[PDB]
Amino acid sequence: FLKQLSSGLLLVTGPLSLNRVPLRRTHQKFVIATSTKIDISGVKIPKHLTDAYFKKKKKYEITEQRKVDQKAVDSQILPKIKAVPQLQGYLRSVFALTNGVYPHKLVF
């Protein structure tokens, strides 16, 4: 997660080297807030991207404006997720429930 948008949707972005998820909007309801923080209070979020940036305007092709911004915010978090041990391996892994595993029984 990075920041809150105007509408209320969230600016949650996966590392494209790890997650294959771009700068994406996602509502807070469909979110498992894990108790694992990284100090992103030193990154520079781009001001030009807002709620109108992520609108479904009208076959989808990634525009050449879009491929700029995914790289520009990556250059600070990609070293930051490697300054933390076994963190880039955490993001490649996908959340799932096994037998004998109950969400209300566990803390995350």
Place this chain on the structure above:
Amino acid sequence: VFRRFVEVGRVAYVSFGPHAGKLVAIVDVIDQNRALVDGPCTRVRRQAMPFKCMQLTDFILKFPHSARQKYVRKAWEKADINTKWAATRWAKKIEARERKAKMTDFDRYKVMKAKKMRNRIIKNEVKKLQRAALLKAS
């Protein structure tokens, strides 16, 4: 053969209730199913407590059968129970469950990746112990 006796001074471990997860010392025996119990250094006031919510240890300390709380604290400070109790293999496996209970999802992930590699080097050692036992035994 019994080794755990409800007597005056055996430290007990409270099982359920608002005093669960705490030590306590039996002052007086009220009845067959109720005891006068007291833990001074563990935030449990002297009160009447049934024999359900207690799992007796083998920590016994001498003081009279109805001695008041200051004579309870000094004997607890004479035998130094809290240092003795945390070193037990009983208290360590209570502490091991809550850690596995409060274990973070990311803490659940690092322990999984380490579980995969700690078992292979066990498994490969068993393999070289499998075939090398099949040489000397023939």
Place this chain on the structure above:
Amino acid sequence: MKASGTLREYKVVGRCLPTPKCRTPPLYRMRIFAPNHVVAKSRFWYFVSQLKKMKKSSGEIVYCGQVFEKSPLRVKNFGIWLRYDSRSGTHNMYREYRDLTTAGAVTQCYRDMGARHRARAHSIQIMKVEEIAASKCRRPAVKQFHDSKIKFPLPHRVLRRQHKPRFTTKRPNTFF
């Protein structure tokens, strides 16, 4: 009376109305054991109606409070004088308990009188609750705890919480 929950001892006092015949009627002190202070008042008028020629309408409640035990951390040998009823006549009993308070010893009476003699709470009239010393105890099942070096194990530990692993693999132990 409905012997519900844990009982309490009450110091309920009252007297008859000031008459143009007698200036000050005498004040009467009563020891009522009751769940709440509401039902203690009607349990007060039950005894005043019998001990004296008075009733609720011709009297009033002077003071109704709940008394506390002076030392609830000293286990004490409580003796109670009873007036229970049977289906064929009534009887008087002197029952002994080893409890904390004047209240809880009465609670341990109504259930034990309700179990051994099938006695209902409304059929039971407490008349005196006397705390006795240790060498002046009578019922021997209480008297087996009057020893300094008292020491005993817990023979067959009846296991509780037998529904959290409702399908387990091991045979659960009753030895500790």
Place this chain on the structure above:
Amino acid sequence: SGRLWCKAIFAGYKRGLRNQREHTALLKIEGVYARDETEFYLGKRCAYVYKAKNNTVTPGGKPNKTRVIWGKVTRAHGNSGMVRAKFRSNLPAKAIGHRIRVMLYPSRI
């Protein structure tokens, strides 16, 4: 890649002793066995997945054979982890004891 709904059992409808009302179902979430631990799955959306003969559409996919009826739990039931649940339609009575899905995505954490 893994199951993201919890296991739920449809024991039966809301009933008294000799009358039942179909407008709420009674779910037995696997894992919870008391009222205190029912607090987490309260509010989450629940679904019954079954398949039929005629092919029906799938939002974001080829028209499949599977159909769903959506619902959500109302409140906790009993003292042993049971929970009520109301659906859009009443659950068909062939779903007795079958597996329905209690997804987490209305989560509040």
Place this chain on the structure above:
Amino acid sequence: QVLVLDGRGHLLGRLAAIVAKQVLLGRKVVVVRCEGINISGNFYRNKLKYLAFLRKRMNTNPSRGPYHFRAPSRIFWRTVRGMLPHKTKRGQAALDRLKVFDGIPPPYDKKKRMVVPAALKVVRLKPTRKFAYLGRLAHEVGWKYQAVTATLEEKRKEKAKIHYRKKKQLMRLRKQAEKNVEKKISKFTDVLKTHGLLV
């Protein structure tokens, strides 16, 4: 996804009423060693209580009356049918998920059998109260296979003993394996020990 229960020492009605809820909830239960089930009270009572059940036959034609079963499992299967709405269609859907067995068939003598401790003799009976094994009761009421089943149970008792006698040795090397491999797994052990897995 299959409930495998061992019948040694569980109280009949206390075991049947528990599995009756489970079998209604679409979870297949197979109960094993139904001869080991124990009932409360002295044996002469439990025997005479069942002899009265045989007596309650149809007077006009005994081929249609209560079908008294003699096997231990079908005795235990009968009391489950009493705690089940068998006249319904969902009740018939319950009864087939139950599969009771005298002793242990081959699909289960090499699997872990579960136990229901909420229904067991050593907890749910005062130890001075008398109790009767069902294996004796069925044998004395018409069952013909107490002896031949006992020969088969005395086969697997030493047969699974060889599995246990080996399994101890298979891990006595494993706990001997860690005794020579510690300085290359201690960096994987402490990260398991600080989260409570080996402590």
Place this chain on the structure above:
RNA sequence: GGAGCCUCGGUUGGCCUCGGAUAGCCGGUCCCCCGGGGGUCCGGUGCGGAGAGCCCUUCGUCCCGGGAAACGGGGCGGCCGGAAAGGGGGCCGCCCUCUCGCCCGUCACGCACCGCACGUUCGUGGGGAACCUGGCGCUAAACCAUUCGUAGACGACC
């Protein structure tokens, strides 16, 4: 031992097992003795050789470095143990496979499908048809009629 159409369905990692006691167990040592048992000792017993658990754990890749592995991962044949309602259970070879398989890291990438639901399975699923292609194979029996009369109302039966 190959691909599609119908139809009936449920389900979405596995646990491969001593026996048994509960006013008792459990593990090791055998310094003791019989033919596996008896007897101890050394440790655990609120079971941590713990089902309050263990095992597998699963984003797919491409390079480089480290730790482990050299005996291992992955091929076609015998071989025994299995009858209570019998496993494809292990082992010996084989000519191909890699220190890829895993764990820490770097490199670079795989519709980043622009917030959204039946996702992810056991699935070569059960069953029915039509079609595959060859190897391997196989060329019946029942009933009726007729006859019998150890049978028999008619059937059946012999």
